[PDB]
């Protein structure tokens, strides 16, 4: 069989299921490395023994066994890398889907909040609705940046083939958020009191979730 992680369907707790699958994977990998490193140990002790006894036969043994070991290592390193990517592509796919959903639904509650306002003062609801939409888009930003961060340390390369993409996502998030704020322009009554609140919230919310950093670049 495969891991139960790949056929889940609520995705509501993707962070946890993933974090957990990753440990099961990470640990299974550690089990194998240990087994090999132990094999290396028994193999190596044997070389130390036959060193002086069969110097000739012994040395051939060392050369041979390195080849094996070198190869076995690489073999493992590849697999863990192959399996790691598969689990990430999936994860990133769910997370993006989950994030979009929130955007989708945060928007609905928003527009309704507005339509309901045309008639009677949905005042507060409009705002709580907007802030939700903002949180949503900003969560998207945070994750994207973070992905660029991990990739910058994992593969300095993969990161470069992502930068153009990151700058493109971050641009449209701003655009969508501004566009969404523009929707208030028609409710003058409301754009005067809700806007300055949502805008600060946006600056405040971004400051908390995805700051700046000074350590390195």
| CATH number of the domain bearing residue 175 | 1.20.120.770
Q: Which residues are annotated as a binding site?
A: 13-16, 143
CB atoms within 10 A of CB 140: 21
Q: What share of the chain is helix, strand, coil (3-state, %, to 5)?
A: 85, 0, 15
Best CA proximity match to 186, nearest among 131, 132, 115: 115
- In whole angstroms, what is the distance from residue 33 CA to residue 51 CA? 26
Helix axes 123-154, 55-119, angle to 10 degrees: 160
Could you identify the residue written with the tokens 């094999």? Answer: 39
Quick check: is 200 in a domain? yes
Best CA proximity match to 130, nearest among 191, 211, 207, 208: 191
Q: Sign of torsion, CA 145 146 152 157?
A: negative
Per-residue CA distances from 15 to 11, 19, 57, 92, 176 (Å): 9, 6, 54, 10, 26
Quick check: is 116 in a domain? yes
Q: Which residues are annotated as a binding site for heparin?
A: 13-16, 143
Quick check: is 79 in a domain? yes
Could you identify the residue written with the tokens 């754009």? Answer: 191
**What is the resolution in angstroms?**
2.7
Quick check: is 216 in a domain? no
Number of folded domains in the chain? Answer: 1
Residue ranges making up the domain that contains 136: 3-211
Quick check: is 91 in a domain? yes
Quick check: is 217 in a domain? no
Best CA proximity match to 98, nearest among 164, 146, 143: 143
Compute φ and ψ for 15, nearest 5 degrees.
-50, -50
Quick check: is 26 in a domain? yes
């Amino acid at each position: 069989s495969q891991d139960p992680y790949f056929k889940i369907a609520n995705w509501t707790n993707e962070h946890d299921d993933f974090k957990k699958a990753e440990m099961r994977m990470d640990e299974k990998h550690r089990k194998k490395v240990d087994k090999v490193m132990k094999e290396w140990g028994d193999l190596e002790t044997r070389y130390n023994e036959q060193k002086a006894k069969d110097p000739k036969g012994a040395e051939k043994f060392k050369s041979q066994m390195n080849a094996r070991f070198q190869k076995t290592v690489s073999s493992l390193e590849e697999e863990h890398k192959r399996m790691r990517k598969e689990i990430e592509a999936v994860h990133e796919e769910r997370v993006q889907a989950m994030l979009n959903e929130k955007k989708r639904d945060a928007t609905h509650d928003y527009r309704q909040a507005l339509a309901t306002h045309v008639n009677k003062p949905n005042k507060h609801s409009v705002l709580q609705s907007l802030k939700a939409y903002i949180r949503a888009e900003e969560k998207d930003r945070m994750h994207t940046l973070n992905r660029y961060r991990h990739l910058l340390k994992a593969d300095s390369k993969e990161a470069a083939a992502y930068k153009p993409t990151v700058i493109h996502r971050l641009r449209y998030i701003d655009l969508r958020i501004n566009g969404t704020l523009a929707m208030l322009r028609d409710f003058p009554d409301l754009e005067k009191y809700v806007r300055p609140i949502a805008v600060t919230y946006w600056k405040d919310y971004r400051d908390e979730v995805s700051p700046d950093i000074s350590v390195e670049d």
